[PDB]
Amino acid sequence: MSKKISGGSVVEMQGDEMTRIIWELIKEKLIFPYVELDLHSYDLGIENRDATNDQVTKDAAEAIKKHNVGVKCATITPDEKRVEEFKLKQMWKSPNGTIRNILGGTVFREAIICKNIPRLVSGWVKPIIIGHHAYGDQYRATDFVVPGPGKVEITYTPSDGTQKVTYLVHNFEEGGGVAMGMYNQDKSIEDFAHSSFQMALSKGWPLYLSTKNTILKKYDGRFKDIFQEIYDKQYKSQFEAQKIWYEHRLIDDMVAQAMKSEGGFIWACKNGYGSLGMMTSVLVCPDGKTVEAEAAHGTVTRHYRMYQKGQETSTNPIASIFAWTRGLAHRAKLDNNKELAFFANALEEVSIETIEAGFMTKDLAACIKGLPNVQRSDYLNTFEFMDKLGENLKIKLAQAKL
Amino acid sequence: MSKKISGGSVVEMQGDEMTRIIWELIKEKLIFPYVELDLHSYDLGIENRDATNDQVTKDAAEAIKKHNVGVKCATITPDEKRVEEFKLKQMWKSPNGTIRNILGGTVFREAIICKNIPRLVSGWVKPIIIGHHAYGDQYRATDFVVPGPGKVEITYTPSDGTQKVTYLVHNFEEGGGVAMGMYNQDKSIEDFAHSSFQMALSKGWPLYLSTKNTILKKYDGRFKDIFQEIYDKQYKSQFEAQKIWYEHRLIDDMVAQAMKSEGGFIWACKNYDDSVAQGYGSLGMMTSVLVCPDGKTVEAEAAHGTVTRHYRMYQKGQETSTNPIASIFAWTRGLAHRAKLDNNKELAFFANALEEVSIETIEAGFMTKDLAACIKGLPNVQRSDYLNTFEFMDKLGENLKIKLAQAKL
Numbered sequence: 136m137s138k139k140i141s142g143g144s145v146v147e148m149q150g151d152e153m154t155r156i157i158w159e160l161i162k163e164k165l166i167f168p169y170v171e172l173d174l175h176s177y178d179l180g181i182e183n184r185d186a187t188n189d190q191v192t193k194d195a196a197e198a199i200k201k202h203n204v205g206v207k208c209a210t211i212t213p214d215e216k217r218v219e220e221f222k223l224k225q226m227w228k229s230p231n232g233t234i235r236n237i238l239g240g241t242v243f244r245e246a247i248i249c250k251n252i253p254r255l256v257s258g259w260v261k262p263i264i265i266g267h268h269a270y271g272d273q274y275r276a277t278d279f280v281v282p283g284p285g286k287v288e289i290t291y292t293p294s295d296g297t298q299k300v301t302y303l304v305h306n307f308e309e310g311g312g313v314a315m316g317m318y319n320q321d322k323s324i325e326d327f328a329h330s331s332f333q334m335a336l337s338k339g340w341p342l343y344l345s346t347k348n349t350i351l352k353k354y355d356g357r358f359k360d361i362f363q364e365i366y367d368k369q370y371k372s373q374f375e376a377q378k379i380w381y382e383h384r385l386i387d388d389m390v391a392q393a394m395k396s397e398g399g400f401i402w403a404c405k406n407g408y409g410s411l412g413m414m415t416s417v418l419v420c421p422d423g424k425t426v427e428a429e430a431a432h433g434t435v436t437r438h439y440r441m442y443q444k445g446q447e448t449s450t451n452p453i454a455s456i457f458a459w460t461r462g463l464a465h466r467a468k469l470d471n472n473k474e475l476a477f478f479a480n481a482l483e484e485v486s487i488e489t490i491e492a493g494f495m496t497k498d499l500a501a502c503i504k505g506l507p508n509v510q511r512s513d514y515l516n517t518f519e520f521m522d523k524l525g526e527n528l529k530i531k532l533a534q535a536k537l
Numbered sequence: 538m539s540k541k542i543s544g545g546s547v548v549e550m551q552g553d554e555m556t557r558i559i560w561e562l563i564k565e566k567l568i569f570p571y572v573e574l575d576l577h578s579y580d581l582g583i584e585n586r587d588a589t590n591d592q593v594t595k596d597a598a599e600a601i602k603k604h605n606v607g608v609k610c611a612t613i614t615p616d617e618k619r620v621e622e623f624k625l626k627q628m629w630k631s632p633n634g635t636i637r638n639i640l641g642g643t644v645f646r647e648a649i650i651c652k653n654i655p656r657l658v659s660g661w662v663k664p665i666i667i668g669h670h671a672y673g674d675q676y677r678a679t680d681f682v683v684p685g686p687g688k689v690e691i692t693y694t695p696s697d698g699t700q701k702v703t704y705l706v707h708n709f710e711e712g713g714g715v716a717m718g719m720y721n722q723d724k725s726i727e728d729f730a731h732s733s734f735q736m737a738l739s740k741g742w743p744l745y746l747s748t749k750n751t752i753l754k755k756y757d758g759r760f761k762d763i764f765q766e767i768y769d770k771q772y773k774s775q776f777e778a779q780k781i782w783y784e785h786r787l788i789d790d791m792v793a794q795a796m797k798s799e800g801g802f803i804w805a806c807k808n809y810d811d812s813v814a815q816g817y818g819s820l821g822m823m824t825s826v827l828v829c830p831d832g833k834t835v836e837a838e839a840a841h842g843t844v845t846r847h848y849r850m851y852q853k854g855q856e857t858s859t860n861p862i863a864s865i866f867a868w869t870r871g872l873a874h875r876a877k878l879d880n881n882k883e884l885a886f887f888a889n890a891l892e893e894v895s896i897e898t899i900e901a902g903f904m905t906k907d908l909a910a911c912i913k914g915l916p917n918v919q920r921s922d923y924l925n926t927f928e929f930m931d932k933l934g935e936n937l938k939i940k941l942a943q944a945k946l
């Protein structure tokens with residue numbers, strides 16, 4: 136290679152514990168040799184967040200909002216046990232939450248599938264992109280305890296001083312109970328519509344909506360309605376191009392049609408098996424520019440203690456890798472970077488293809504040969520698996536020089 | 538059969554399509570030859586519910602409410618194409634819905650475990666009974682639309698008149714959306730508690746309650762606060778009698794714990810959609826039994842659909858390979874329960890013998906294309922690796938004859 140690819144503007148977010156070591160190995164051995172980036176790196180490790188009073192995570196938020204691409208390493212969501220581990224000054228909020236609240240958009244999870252790994256239904260040769268709602272949860276759902284008898288009613292009082300409307304969720308004639316309250320603004324449904332519609336074009340796959348409008352009068356209905364409204368006003372001519380179609384089926388048919396399906400569609404369902412190390416979540420924002428990619432697991436603290444105590448460790452990096460490769464593939468779309476485009480997809484193909492050739496870590500090996508029959512020779516540690524990914528990537532990029 | 542065993546009073550429900558065919562094969566080859574029942578048989582087939590204007594289903598529900606055991610066959614719930622198929626005069630409501638709404642109770646789904654069948658990933662040596670809420674969650678779950686900006690909020694005013702809590706659920710600044718309100722009575726969660734202890738009490742496995750506290754803390758807090766007191770004030774001494782117990786772990790803890798445990802526990806989930814490792818692959822291997830809190834009346838049914846695809850093969854003269862194990866275990870679960878109500882030791886042994894010879898026969902290598910595809914791989918399985926539906930019934934009937942004859946000697 137004459138010159139390294141000109142990446143462009145990407146925001147990088149370092150994490151902590153096991154995945155922090157994976158992260159550097161990934162940059163050092165896979166990304167940096169081949170791509171130069173205008174890198175906006177932030178240190179979202181727990182020590183620094185503690186030291187900067189969580190200010191650094193807010194800066195990351197604002198920087199993805201500007202440069203439209205982010206790739207994030209798994210971070211510790213602390214608790215009471217970890218404020219003794221690091222003597223935190225305060226129980227900080229989740230970094231992942233604080234970016235989803237600031238940046239907005241819709242998370243999309245996808246499991247990466249190798250032809251020689253077990254699966255739930257063995258017909259799913261194409262992966263399934265399941266992305267439900269925003270924020271990690273529809274913000275709150277105020278719920279109380281109704282200790283004794285009395286009416287519980289939910290009221291809507293219009294801001295323009297018009298007639299108030301009460302509904303009566305239940306009158307408790309005798310005995311206790313429990314009560315609940317949800318809601319869903321309208322904008323968050325259009326943001327959900329656009330985000331999910333865009334991923335259908337970005338991936339060239341069909342998009343399905345699933346609801347329970349049969350039981351819920353007009354809560355789940357309002358979803359169906361706004362999608363049809365948006366789907367016929369925009370994106371309908373764009374779907375006709377790339378063969379993609381959209382349709383809304385009932386959730387109970389869709390659950391069985393998933394097993395009936397062969398894979399390769401997007402499923403947005405108004406609400407975890409899978410090696411826990413092959414799943415990559417992507418937050419796609421409503422504008423269709425800014426997008427944060429990251430892995431869907433955690434800091435792998437048990438495998439970090441094996442690293443701390445010097446032990447051998449066999450941790451799986453594919454989930455983190457494909458955070459880089461989705462982020463880079465997105466920037467290559469924005470900048471119309473035809474050469475970063477190919478690099479990203481190539482990187483995705485060695486990971487999957489290096490596993491298909493029998494080179495994998497312990498977790499993947501336990502999926503095939505069962506955990507009680509996994510042998511040292513059936514898997515690689517954490518390093519020499521990256522070493523094998525590295526040289527396979529050098530081998531493949533040299534090939535694709537024509 | 539010289540004086541075959543006298544099984545009690547039981548309600549039978551006939552279904553639709555290829556499961557209706559299996560139901561007759563089950564009675565003809567497996568049930569009737571060895572048992573005599575005061576049989577309250579109802580025809581829930583689609584064209585009968587259309588002719589009775591769904592009155593046959595209400596009638597069959599009353600019968601289970603009166604006679605305490607019902608054994609159902611998979612039935613068609615109609616849609617737009619089904620009302621055009623049979624030319625129905627109304628898109629009738631699901632019989633399962635209609636009956637569950639009458640009997641009430643809670644539904645438990647048990648996975649039938651065979652040794653030579655790849656069930657998830659080895660490990661599990663015994664099934665797992667997964668139970669969910671009682672009356673769905675609708676009825677009075679009030680939802681609606683928010684026309685414009687304003688404050689949506691929930692107010693609890695006791696019959697005491699002594700206070701009033703107001704919870705803002707959301708203030709609409711933009712204008713527009715949907716809001717709702719749900720609830721649950723203690724009597725409804727107390728029913729979950731009995732039904733779930735009664736089930737654990739029926740078998741000999743321990744009961745677990747997996748709640749979610751990070752999402753709806755206070756809503757789910759009441760569940761572990763209605764179970765543990767009923768367990769302690771009514772069930773702990775009986776559970777402490779046998780090797781049973783009642784604990785309470787958590788969702789992300791339970792799913793990590795169950796992927797190492799040898800199976801054998803009643804699991805109460807409080808979520809809204811189901812098919813974890815339970816509805817895995819071949820639905821032909823899962824039962825489903827509604828339990829009324831009384832512990833008397835129950836209603837078994839195979840957890841899969843009417844298998845339309847194979848009934849079309851039947852109509853065109855093709856040989857089929859549909860798995861009857863689920864419908865076969867609709868009977869034994871329900872016959873074993875009838876035996877418990879009457880101490881019918883003869884019937885409990887039979888029902889139990891049928892659960893053995895059905896698994897024995899699959900473990901022996903004699904199975905249907907349904908299962909064989911799991912072992913070999915669907916393109917791999919040659920004709921010679923499975924059995925016809927009739928072949929499979931014939932070998933059950935054959936091995937059940939030998940299983941009942943031997944222990945009778």
Ligand SMILES: CN1CCN(C)[C@H](CCN2CC[C@H](c3ccc(F)cc3)C2)C1
Nearest residue numbers: 411412432433434435436437450451498
């Ligand atoms: C993500 N959680 C955070 C909390 N705990 C420390 C968990 C313990 C690690 N488990 C054991 C192997 C699995 C695994 C395998 C490969 C991977 F790349 C990641 C995880 C998960 C992991």
Ligand SMILES: CN1CCN(C)[C@H](CCN2CC[C@H](c3ccc(F)cc3)C2)C1
Nearest residue numbers: 820821841842843844845846859860907
């Ligand atoms: C089970 N429902 C029935 C209602 N639908 C029409 C669905 C189609 C049935 N598919 C055909 C082969 C599978 C199958 C094979 C053996 C079985 F015993 C059950 C299912 C599932 C699913």
